[PDB]
Paper text:
FCoV-23 is a recently emerged, highly pathogenic recombinant coronavirus responsible for a widespread outbreak of feline infectious peritonitis. All coronaviruses are decorated with several copies of a homotrimeric spike (S) glycoprotein that is the target of neutralizing antibodies, drives viral entry through receptor binding and membrane fusion and contributes to pathogenesis. FCoV-23 S-long comprises an amino-terminal S1 subunit, folding as five domains designated 0 and A–D, and a C-terminal S2 subunit. Collectively, these findings identify APN as a bona fide entry receptor for FCoV-23, which seems to have broad receptor species tropism, mirroring that of CCoV-HuPn-2018.
Residue numbers in the entry:
A (entry chain C): 803 to 856
B (entry chain C): 1186 to 1295
C (entry chain A): 265 to 389, 402 to 677, 682 to 787, 801 to 975, 982 to 1085, 1098 to 1307
D (entry chain B): 1077 to 1085, 1098 to 1185
E (entry chain B): 857 to 911
F (entry chain B): 967 to 975, 982 to 1021
Amino acid sequence: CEPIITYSNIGVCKNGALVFINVTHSDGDVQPISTGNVTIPTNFTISVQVEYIQ
Amino acid sequence: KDKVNECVRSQSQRFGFCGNGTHLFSLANAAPNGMIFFHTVLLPTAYETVTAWSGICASDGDHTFGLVVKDVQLTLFRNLDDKFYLTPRTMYQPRVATISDFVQIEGCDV
Amino acid sequence: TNVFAPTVGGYIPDGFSFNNWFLLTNDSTFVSGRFVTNQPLLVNCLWPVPSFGVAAQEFCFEGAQFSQCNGVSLNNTVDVIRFNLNFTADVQSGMGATVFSLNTTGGVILEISCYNDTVRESSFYPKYCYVLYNGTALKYLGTLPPSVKEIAISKWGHFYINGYNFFSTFPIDCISFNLTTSTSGAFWTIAYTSYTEALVQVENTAIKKVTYCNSHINNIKCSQLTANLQNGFYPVASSEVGLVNKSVVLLPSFYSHTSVNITIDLGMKLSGYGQPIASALSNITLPMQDNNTDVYCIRSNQFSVYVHSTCKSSLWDNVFNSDCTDVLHATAVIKTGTCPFSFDKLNNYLTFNKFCLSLHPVGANCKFDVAARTRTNEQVVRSLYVIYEEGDNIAGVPSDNDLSVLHLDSCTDYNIYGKTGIGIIRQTNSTLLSGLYYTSLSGDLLGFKNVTDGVVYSVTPCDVSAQAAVIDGTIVGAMTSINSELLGLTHWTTTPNFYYYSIYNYTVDCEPIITYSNIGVCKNGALVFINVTHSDGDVQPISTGNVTIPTNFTISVQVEYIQVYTTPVSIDCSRYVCNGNPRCNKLLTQYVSACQTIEQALAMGARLENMEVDSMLFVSENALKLASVEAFNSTEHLDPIYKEWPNIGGSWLGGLKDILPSHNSKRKYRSAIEDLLFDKVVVDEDYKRCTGGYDIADLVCAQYYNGIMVLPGVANDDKMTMYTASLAGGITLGALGGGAVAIPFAVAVQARLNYVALQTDVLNKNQQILANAFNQAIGNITQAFGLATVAKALAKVQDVVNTQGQALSHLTVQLQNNFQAISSSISDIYNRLDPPSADAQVDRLITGRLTALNAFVSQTLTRQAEVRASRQLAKDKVNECVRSQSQRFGFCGNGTHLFSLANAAPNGMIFFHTVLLPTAYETVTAWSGICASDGDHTFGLVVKDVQLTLFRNLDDKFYLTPRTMYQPRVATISDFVQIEGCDVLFVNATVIELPG
Amino acid sequence: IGNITQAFGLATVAKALAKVQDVVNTQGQALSHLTVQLQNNFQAISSSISDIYNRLDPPSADAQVDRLITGRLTALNAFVSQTLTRQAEVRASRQLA
Amino acid sequence: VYTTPVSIDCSRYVCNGNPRCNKLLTQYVSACQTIEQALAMGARLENMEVDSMLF
Amino acid sequence: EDLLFDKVVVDEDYKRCTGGYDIADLVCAQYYNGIMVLPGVANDDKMTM
Ligand SMILES: *[C@@H]1O[C@H](CO)[C@@H](O[C@@H]2O[C@H](CO)[C@@H](O[C@@H]3O[C@H](CO[C@H]4O[C@H](CO)[C@@H](O)[C@H](O)[C@@H]4O)[C@@H](O)[C@H](O[C@H]4O[C@H](CO)[C@@H](O)[C@H](O)[C@@H]4O)[C@@H]3O)[C@H](O)[C@H]2NC(C)=O)[C@H](O)[C@H]1NC(C)=O
Ligand SMILES: *[C@@H]1O[C@H](CO)[C@@H](O[C@@H]2O[C@H](CO)[C@@H](O[C@@H]3O[C@H](CO[C@H]4O[C@H](CO)[C@@H](O)[C@H](O)[C@@H]4O)[C@@H](O)[C@H](O[C@H]4O[C@H](CO)[C@@H](O)[C@H](O)[C@@H]4O)[C@@H]3O)[C@H](O)[C@H]2NC(C)=O)[C@H](O)[C@H]1NC(C)=O
Ligand SMILES: *[C@@H]1O[C@H](CO)[C@@H](O[C@@H]2O[C@H](CO)[C@@H](O[C@@H]3O[C@H](CO)[C@@H](O)[C@H](O)[C@@H]3O)[C@H](O)[C@H]2NC(C)=O)[C@H](O)[C@H]1NC(C)=O
Ligand SMILES: *[C@@H]1O[C@H](CO)[C@@H](O[C@@H]2O[C@H](CO)[C@@H](O[C@@H]3O[C@H](CO)[C@@H](O)[C@H](O)[C@@H]3O)[C@H](O)[C@H]2NC(C)=O)[C@H](O)[C@H]1NC(C)=O
Ligand SMILES: *[C@@H]1O[C@H](CO)[C@@H](O[C@@H]2O[C@H](CO)[C@@H](O[C@@H]3O[C@H](CO)[C@@H](O)[C@H](O)[C@@H]3O)[C@H](O)[C@H]2NC(C)=O)[C@H](O)[C@H]1NC(C)=O
Ligand SMILES: *[C@@H]1O[C@H](CO)[C@@H](O[C@@H]2O[C@H](CO)[C@@H](O)[C@H](O)[C@H]2NC(C)=O)[C@H](O)[C@H]1NC(C)=O
Ligand SMILES: *[C@@H]1O[C@H](CO)[C@@H](O[C@@H]2O[C@H](CO)[C@@H](O)[C@H](O)[C@H]2NC(C)=O)[C@H](O)[C@H]1NC(C)=O
Ligand SMILES: *[C@@H]1O[C@H](CO)[C@@H](O[C@@H]2O[C@H](CO)[C@@H](O)[C@H](O)[C@H]2NC(C)=O)[C@H](O)[C@H]1NC(C)=O
Ligand SMILES: *[C@@H]1O[C@H](CO)[C@@H](O[C@@H]2O[C@H](CO)[C@@H](O)[C@H](O)[C@H]2NC(C)=O)[C@H](O)[C@H]1NC(C)=O
Ligand SMILES: *[C@@H]1O[C@H](CO)[C@@H](O[C@@H]2O[C@H](CO)[C@@H](O)[C@H](O)[C@H]2NC(C)=O)[C@H](O)[C@H]1NC(C)=O
Ligand SMILES: *[C@@H]1O[C@H](CO)[C@@H](O[C@@H]2O[C@H](CO)[C@@H](O)[C@H](O)[C@H]2NC(C)=O)[C@H](O)[C@H]1NC(C)=O
Ligand SMILES: *[C@@H]1O[C@H](CO)[C@@H](O[C@@H]2O[C@H](CO)[C@@H](O)[C@H](O)[C@H]2NC(C)=O)[C@H](O)[C@H]1NC(C)=O
Ligand SMILES: *[C@@H]1O[C@H](CO)[C@@H](O[C@@H]2O[C@H](CO)[C@@H](O)[C@H](O)[C@H]2NC(C)=O)[C@H](O)[C@H]1NC(C)=O
Ligand SMILES: *[C@@H]1O[C@H](CO)[C@@H](O[C@@H]2O[C@H](CO)[C@@H](O)[C@H](O)[C@H]2NC(C)=O)[C@H](O)[C@H]1NC(C)=O
Ligand SMILES: *[C@@H]1O[C@H](CO)[C@@H](O[C@@H]2O[C@H](CO)[C@@H](O)[C@H](O)[C@H]2NC(C)=O)[C@H](O)[C@H]1NC(C)=O
Ligand SMILES: CCCCCC/C=C\CCCCCCCC(=O)O
Ligand SMILES: CCCCCC/C=C\CCCCCCCC(=O)O
Ligand SMILES: *[C@@H]1O[C@H](CO)[C@@H](O)[C@H](O)[C@H]1NC(C)=O
Ligand SMILES: *[C@@H]1O[C@H](CO)[C@@H](O)[C@H](O)[C@H]1NC(C)=O
Ligand SMILES: *[C@@H]1O[C@H](CO)[C@@H](O)[C@H](O)[C@H]1NC(C)=O
Ligand SMILES: *[C@@H]1O[C@H](CO)[C@@H](O)[C@H](O)[C@H]1NC(C)=O
Ligand SMILES: *[C@@H]1O[C@H](CO)[C@@H](O)[C@H](O)[C@H]1NC(C)=O
Ligand SMILES: *[C@@H]1O[C@H](CO)[C@@H](O)[C@H](O)[C@H]1NC(C)=O
């Protein structure tokens, strides 16, 4: 289920079930390697992120 | 102030400073007692695989010399027609390599 | 063993076990911790008694008469006598049922007798123990428990069994005993002890270590609540002042003295239980004044007060015609009562404008308490009222005689114009034209004027604050403002700001151990100067003339600690303010707004930090697959094009084995340095154990009971550890979209080197030197963690942990404040007062606890803001030093940054920055440009890349090199920009001799 | 540089001067308040311990001295908290510098 | 860049050298220890920070 | 530097406080109260260099 309220690794869903919150996963960082088979990002979309500063 | 100067009025070379991803541009709006920034980033959805080489060992009979890419931020690879291409690692934008893109050195690497 | 030999002065040796020794208390027993206490631990004489032996003696406390003492025996008075033996039912007494025979004041004999059958009260004969007065049971003590291990009797009549005072008799003069036992192992001890101050460590209500505060270093140890002192500077006092003269300075006046004698005639009777009762019909007679003996006013300039007491006895009919016997003898005393001064201190140079003593309460500012003191008690019988006015016309003197006596150039107790203190009074040359005396901002007297000749005298303290330097648990030096010996130091030297006493032979080339600013103290006590750090200098972007480029590089590793998160706490305001009491909750329903504000602030702070931390941490599965010591030590994940390399780690593994996680760890993904930092600087977060009730609750469970919940933090530590491991493992990940294909660490280091400066020596490469330097640096860091940067990081983490602990400790201890109420317990208040009277008492506690909670919330919010700024710094460091190479100069440590690794630390992280340290310079002749001539056409050429230096080799060929590293390369025509003019500093050349 | 030197004996110069003046004043006031806290009676007959012990018996004087002890300990705790907060702020400023 | 660091003798501030006041403060010695330790640690950390910056 | 240190802003010698040759000033009185301001002239010299 999709947790509604979370703290640390604990999450509570709408139906009351308790779920585990794991750390976010990502593909990884592109490394400055120029030897062998390497991967370069090709197909790009747009993401917008919002930050507030006082 | 740092965010406005380095994300809105220019593009910063600092990695990850203007949001998670490759920063494109930032806009700003006024908020109670401060401001909010909209950072626009490029999100990759695919990868191209290329066979990259760290240099070219060129032989002209008895004279063997190495060639390295002058710009350290470029990856050198080969196309299907055995022609050398250079691409940046942020985006896949291949281009044909010229002699002015290389530095000549004495030795060669394995 | 239970037998020890007292050292010089009567101090228990450090090798003792204290098997049958406890801490004496009148209240609750400390379970664990260190406490500075005044306990009877000065052993004057230790009598060892062997098995089957007999210990029989009659001891008087004002009579250090001793029989056998293994060891030296002191000659001071004995305060407590302790029997350290297993007082079971197999211990025989030579007096029969009586185990102890007490001779109290006045000749009253009391016995402590145990019987095998119950004895009724006021009658005569499992073991039941009783206190007998005249053969009759006076007090029932109870059955003997099976676990008695020590009985301590004090000269004031108190009995301690296993450390707790269970009964007190009258003050004892002499104690007769006659005991023997057979099951007491080999020896059981009788100790005569006197009270002394000491720092005691207790674990499970048992003494483990006793440090006596008998020396200067021991005084510092007792002040720091620890027997192991870290090297540093500690504030102390220069000396101790005692037995000084007295100086009195008063304004000129006439000298007429009056003696005021108060006669007190006490009436005494014997009650039904034999206790002497002082009659309220006691009479007070004042000196006759204006035909009256009930009011007396001082009419002279000086006076003294004396009391004369007479005693008479009655027979329950208030007819006093006899003389008080030994039991009924009493002495009249005057007690302070409600007055701001004591009666016995009136002759201590107290000044008034009016002073009258009366027997009537009207018009009186305060009253004294006239009491009769018997051999056992002290009972108030009358009141003496005082009418006084503050001033200086009338002074109370010790006796009839000039009252102005002044001792100069020495420590003295002074009373000058009403201001009292201890100090040294000196004569000055200064001329202040106004005033009589002068005070400081704190109200302390600084100087005063003689009213006869106008000379001004200054007053200084006898003792001043000093700083003691402690290295390896000994005092080696002291910084002080007085040129006098202190702390046992004799040799001294002069500094422009202070005097420095030392163990060093003063009428120095040494490595200072403790430093502050420009001051350093070595191990031998010598004082040294600390100058500013020196360096060769920064490389300048100059390309004209003879310039130097760094060539020979080694590796330096620098350690930095940054805090990322706090330890969040949830508080139940209702449970903290009210300990579950429904009536207190009903009262707090009127303050519910304050509790709501406190809870909302704490919850919002915790939610904001959790949101901030959540968006910062991430992992990669493929990166985590390679993030281990085992993975770096194998070639399973290596790309087949790296068949020459034995494994991923290569030559760098010797340094990487302490940073990467290993299977030989307490927890998952944990490395050697992480374990060292989490064990050398720092419990259970399960709440289910607190409510089990299977043992006495610990500190965390007690805080929970008080409504203080520490939120989970092990998950955050695990997330940080996995985050750092993934960051470390991503360096060697060849590609992202597939499996865990790995590259050797040397290849990544070479890529970083090329990023620093384009490497032009492909064949002759020496990465072995860099790898060995890195391995040795990491080994030294690991050794230091179990190198100033390492010390700074350790100090920072220790400070963070200590502050976090103290913040909660203060809040928890705030619950024992009475806040001007009869008790700090709500249940106690509601069990002693009616609800209308109890609500007023509970209101004060409620307000005080709400104020304490508000203070705690404010401090927590400030800490959270500071840690938020620190977290921003840490995020910048991770993004620009670990996940990439920053172009910012000096951001990733001092030097040319190569790469950074990270590990998890308590409440944050530590970074290892690897930098290139040059060890040599190459000198080249640099040119700013080339002026090329082709006959009539002369044009300039400049280097297109401003970061390159152009020079010439021996064969007259132009080369370009970066200034970060000396990596020369042959210049081509594409490296130059053509311009019209030429500069004077350009090098002249022809078309033939141009590059390319 | 000549204009700056003249102004020091140009809004940036004014802001810098105001900042340094504020720092110095705050540093002075922090110690002034702690020193002046020693004249508080804390609901006792006097704020001088020597005066208390020269007018009352030790059993009566200990109760008076206890109030002064508690008040001065509270003042020291407040001073320590304020000093630590100032130190953290200056640490961030030092990182910026 | 730096503050003006202060050392406080807690015993001398609370008790103006009076031995009886010191005997009474022996029961609060923990509070004085906490105050001194906090001040000393703060001063030591800032000195360490400033030392590594200047050259 | 001189203009800023004179237009915006003493003695750090403690030996003078215990001399008793005149009435103590504010710093000496604070020392008498157990308040020690640690040396700062060295830090100013280091910053200047
Ligand atoms: C910074 O910004 C980057 C993006 O620029 C973020 O990275 C992305 O993070 C998301 C979330 O982790 C990644 O998405 C996940 O990818 C997994 C792999 O997908 C497989 O299947 C797809 C099918 O189309 C293939 O295209 C792909 O190649 C893989 O074979 C998915 O399995 C995940 O699925 C999620 O949803 C399903 C359905 O509910 C669940 O079952 C899964 O458990 C999971 O929750 C998910 O789509 C994404 O790949 C990352 N992109 C990149 C480029 O790295 C960073 O996370 C962000 N950092 C921070 C700190 O915010
Ligand atoms: C940032 O990081 C850089 C390094 O990258 C640090 O700079 C180094 O700092 C040290 C310490 O000051 C410097 O070392 C000193 O060099 C002096 C000069 O050496 C002469 O003799 C040697 C002999 O081999 C020659 O090679 C050299 O060319 C000189 O002719 C030495 O005299 C110093 O000796 C020290 O030890 C002896 C013995 O105990 C003492 O008698 C000396 O007084 C002294 O204490 C010392 O070795 C080093 O040169 C600097 N390197 C560079 C490249 O600048 C920065 O200090 C650091 N910055 C910060 C703020 O930490
Ligand atoms: C949260 O995410 C992490 C990282 O992806 C997960 O770590 C993964 O944990 C599992 C379970 O332990 C590992 O798989 C197992 O490991 C053991 C090793 O002995 C092996 O016996 C099994 O065959 C299996 O492979 C897995 O390797 C590990 N992944 C990584 C990349 O390290 C973690 O489990 C997640 N937590 C939750 C609650 O889902
Ligand atoms: C901490 O760092 C120091 C840096 O010097 C390390 O000392 C160095 O340790 C190495 C390895 O033991 C020594 O190498 C050996 O040198 C001798 C003498 O030339 C040679 O006979 C051996 O075959 C070997 O090559 C090196 O000399 C030594 N350097 C110095 C100046 O003593 C030290 O080991 C590090 N500590 C830890 C715990 O890693
Ligand atoms: C503060 O900055 C102002 C910037 O204008 C300085 O004023 C300038 O001072 C120079 C030097 O005295 C003047 O140059 C002279 O100009 C006259 C007129 O052309 C010429 O006859 C002289 O031979 C000389 O070249 C300049 O005109 C003047 N500018 C203005 C707008 O007044 C001023 O001196 C600075 N203050 C200090 C204390 O340095
Ligand atoms: C990079 O990947 C390519 C495929 O994308 C690999 O080339 C294949 O290698 C396999 C295994 O030897 C051969 O069976 C295929 O015929 C190859 N394909 C082509 C088009 O040549 C290549 O070996 C990989 N390179 C490295 C260095 O690992
Ligand atoms: C990037 O996106 C492009 C556009 O969608 C992809 O190219 C198409 O891929 C689809 C799906 O396989 C094919 O049906 C089309 O024929 C492709 N079009 C062209 C013009 O090639 C492309 O594959 C994506 N890049 C990567 C590396 O996956
Ligand atoms: C202490 O008690 C022992 C017995 O436990 C007393 O020794 C007894 O003394 C009486 C009187 O002389 C003898 O009749 C007994 O035979 C003795 N008993 C033993 C076992 O020797 C001893 O006198 C007492 N010591 C005192 C009171 O100082
Ligand atoms: C209990 O102690 C009292 C007080 O010391 C003892 O009574 C004294 O006995 C001696 C014997 O020589 C007389 O000189 C004293 O005058 C007595 N004092 C009083 C006040 O009468 C008494 O003997 C002791 N009882 C014992 C030891 O059993
Ligand atoms: C009281 O009895 C206890 C045991 O109940 C004795 O302590 C034991 O002493 C023996 C002999 O040295 C050790 O082997 C045991 O380990 C001890 N038990 C413990 C420490 O729990 C103790 O010595 C006796 N005391 C006296 C004064 O005789
Ligand atoms: C205090 O003084 C009063 C008044 O003189 C005494 O009370 C008188 O005592 C005598 C002698 O017994 C009686 O004859 C009177 O009748 C008593 N007068 C009153 C009014 O009761 C009293 O005894 C004195 N108290 C002492 C000396 O302790
Ligand atoms: C204040 O000054 C006067 C005047 O100097 C001091 O009185 C002198 O005392 C000395 C020592 O006893 C005598 O030799 C002088 O003759 C006195 N001079 C007079 C009376 O004029 C007085 O002692 C000083 N007061 C104090 C408290 O030191
Ligand atoms: C740079 O230093 C070199 C030496 O490293 C200088 O060249 C020497 O100059 C001296 C003094 O005139 C001559 O005696 C030597 O014969 C020169 N040596 C060589 C190899 O030419 C050079 O002058 C310096 N350059 C500058 C611009 O100061
Ligand atoms: C950088 O280090 C290299 C390697 O040690 C130095 O070159 C050697 O220097 C020693 C000491 O003078 C000579 O005995 C060797 O013959 C040198 N070897 C070579 C191959 O030249 C070099 O001098 C150092 N660089 C600088 C600028 O001092
Ligand atoms: C490069 O050649 C030019 C042209 O000859 C030199 O410039 C001459 O400098 C001398 C003094 O050294 C003057 O007296 C001449 O008048 C200059 N000539 C011209 C045409 O301006 C220049 O000095 C040479 N540069 C170097 C570095 O040797
Ligand atoms: C009479 C006063 C003389 C003053 C001399 C000052 C010298 C040393 C003070 C050091 C205190 C700085 C705090 C660090 C303390 C520590 O290292 O434990
Ligand atoms: C009305 C005639 C003068 C009054 C005389 C008073 C007698 C004694 C003076 C006492 C005050 C002394 C003040 C000291 C003044 C100074 O020396 O500065
Ligand atoms: C106590 O012991 C005596 C002597 O042996 C015996 O007479 C008496 O009955 C015993 N009392 C009990 C309750 O056992
Ligand atoms: C104590 O008891 C004995 C024996 O009955 C008796 O003679 C004596 O008077 C009693 N003493 C007291 C003070 O009651
Ligand atoms: C007190 O003064 C006398 C002289 O009046 C002197 O002998 C004695 O030593 C002094 N006592 C001290 C300073 O304790
Ligand atoms: C007051 O008592 C003292 C002794 O304290 C005595 O010398 C003096 O003569 C008495 N004065 C009287 C009774 O007036
Ligand atoms: C103070 O007076 C004494 C005695 O005349 C003299 O020796 C000393 O030098 C004077 N001090 C000053 C500062 O004038
Ligand atoms: C200190 O050294 C001197 C010589 O400089 C010597 O005479 C004296 O005995 C030494 N003092 C000691 C060792 O206490």
